[PDB]
């Protein structure tokens, strides 16, 4: 991984991208709080399995102990789902494209207690990505940065330096001036602070849904939530 060029880095990351999954949305009945949370957790749980395979394909990730891999994914999983959701949603102003069969607007967020505030933050991030004209090659770098960074507090730091070089090379090749390259790099990374925030608020939300027996949480999703010890 440390000897990859920027171009090889971008290829490996684009190559590693997980598929877009469908929800189990059934249009024959009205939504309730329980059924909408059921759909969203069912989707998340299926995506987590693909996320694990994607992480293994992120250069540098498989060089770590199993303990360090587990820790990073436990720390980052919800940020990674959210950044993927915000990316998918970019060309649907005012909506979140949870799946191609599940495109939700903020008023449908109101169906679940406390979710609308989180939908608003996701919609705002999706509008920022659009305003910035975020490119696919940049999105895959940001997604890898979240995985390596979010739980890191020396090998990790070197790979993170290599991803920075890669973002800069992308911007340079797109014709941004030297000053525009650093300004953009900063705007991209400052959005990660906001994704972290949304992830913390989303985790507290999911925990409350669980503690109120709104939706059953099993298996991998249950264990990744419990890892946060709320």
């Amino acid at each position: 991984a440390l000897s990859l060029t920027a171009d090889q880095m971008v290829s490996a990351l684009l190559d590693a991208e997980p598929p877009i999954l469908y929800s189990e949305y059934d249009p024959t009945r009205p939504f309730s709080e329980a059924s909408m949370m059921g759909l969203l957790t069912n989707l998340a749980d299926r995506e987590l399995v693909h996320m694990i395979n994607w992480a293994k394909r992120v250069p540098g990730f498989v060089d770590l102990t199993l303990h360090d891999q587990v820790h990073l994914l436990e720390c980052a999983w919800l940020e990674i789902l959210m950044i993927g959701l915000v990316w998918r949603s970019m060309e649907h102003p005012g909506k979140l494209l949870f799946a191609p069969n599940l495109l939700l607007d903020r008023n449908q967020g109101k169906c679940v207690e406390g979710m609308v505030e989180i939908f608003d933050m996701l919609l705002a991030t999706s509008s920022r990505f659009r305003m910035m004209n975020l490119q696919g090659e940049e999105f895959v770098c940001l997604k890898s940065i979240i995985l390596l960074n979010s739980g890191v507090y020396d090998h990790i730091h070197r790979v993170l330096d290599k991803i920075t070089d890669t973002l800069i090379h992308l911007m340079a090749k797109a014709g941004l001036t030297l000053q525009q390259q650093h300004q953009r790099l900063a705007q991209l990374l400052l959005i990660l602070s906001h994704i972290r925030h949304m992830s913390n608020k989303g985790m507290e939300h999911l925990y409350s849904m669980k503690c109120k027996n709104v939706v059953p949480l099993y298996g991998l999703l249950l264990e990744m939530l419990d890892a946060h010890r709320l």
Binding site: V49, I52, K56, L66, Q69, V70, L73, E74, G219, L220, E223, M224
Partner: peptide, 6 residues
Amino acid sequence: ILHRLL
């Protein structure tokens, strides 16, 4: 489970 799937 995550440790196993990794």
